[PDB]
Amino acid sequence: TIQPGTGYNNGYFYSYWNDGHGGVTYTNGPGGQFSVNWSNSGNFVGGKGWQPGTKNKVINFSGSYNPNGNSYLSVYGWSRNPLIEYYIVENFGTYNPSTGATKLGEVTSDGSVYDIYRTQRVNQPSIIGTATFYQYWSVRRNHRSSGSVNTANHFNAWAQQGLTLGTMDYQIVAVEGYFSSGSASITVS
């Protein structure tokens, strides 16, 4: 059981953030494993992966994901110059995070069609401070809690549609929750 922050565990980068509200337990396991157990949480994000990520990484993830409420399971990360927060969403609970966003295409990868969206965050927290920046989304139609993500298929499809990325920062498989309950146990490689 760990307290929010970032570091390296068993060769993997991890990041665990929460808004202080309580009701979240995050645990680093051996190798690429992490667990998240939450009950009437606030907002939180936690996972394992790489710092920095790359534009041609094939990310594998295996485990179980049981949300009760608003939660996502994603390949999640940032780029710099331009500043971009991006999500490849594999599963989610009661809220589809692309709701109300602008659809910018479709890409087929790793056994499913994904829908592509762009949203804008105005004067929100970021890896370089309060900023205004775009978010890019790929949302998998056929939900799953295990699989392989070929990131290059998404990054290239985004670029075709005008959604360009800069220099990669961290790149993790992440469980995100917003005032919900659930359990997840995921192993990354």
Swiss-Prot record:
Reaction(s) catalysed by this chain's protein: Endohydrolysis of (1->4)-beta-D-xylosidic linkages in xylans
Catalytic residues (positions): E85, E176
Described purpose of this protein according to its UniProt entry: Glycoside hydrolase involved in the hydrolysis of xylan, a major plant cell wall hemicellulose made up of 1,4-beta-linked D-xylopyranose residues. Catalyzes the endohydrolysis of the main-chain 1,4-beta-glycosidic bonds connecting the xylose subunits yielding various xylooligosaccharides and xylose. The catalysis proceeds by a double-displacement reaction mechanism with a putative covalent glycosyl-enzyme intermediate, with retention of the anomeric configuration. Produces xylobiose and xylose as the main degradation products.
Name of the protein in question: Endo-1,4-beta-xylanase 2
Classification lineage: Eukaryota, Fungi, Dikarya, Ascomycota, Pezizomycotina
Family note: Belongs to the glycosyl hydrolase 11 (cellulase G) family.
Molecular function as annotated in GO: endo-1,4-beta-xylanase activity
Localization in the cell: Secreted
Cellular compartments per GO CC: extracellular region
Pathway(s) served: Glycan degradation; xylan degradation
Activity vs pH: Optimum pH is 4.5-5.5. Stable from pH 3.0 to 8.5 at room temperature and from pH 4.0 to 7.5 at 40 degrees Celsius.
Gene Ontology biological-process entries: xylan catabolic process
Positions annotated with a glycan in the UniProt record: N37, N60
Residues noted as binding substrate in the record, renumbered to the chain: Y72, Y76, Y87, R121, P125, Q135, Y170
Chief localization: secreted
Top-rank EC class of the record's enzyme: hydrolase
All residue ranges annotated as the GH11 domain in the record: 1-188
Induction: Induced by D-xylose, dependent on the cellulase and xylanase regulator xyr1. Repressed by glucose through negative regulation by the crabon catabolite repressor cre1.
This enzyme's EC code(s): 3.2.1.8
Keywords: Carbohydrate metabolism, Glycoprotein, Glycosidase, Hydrolase, Polysaccharide degradation, Pyrrolidone carboxylic acid, Secreted, Signal, Xylan degradation
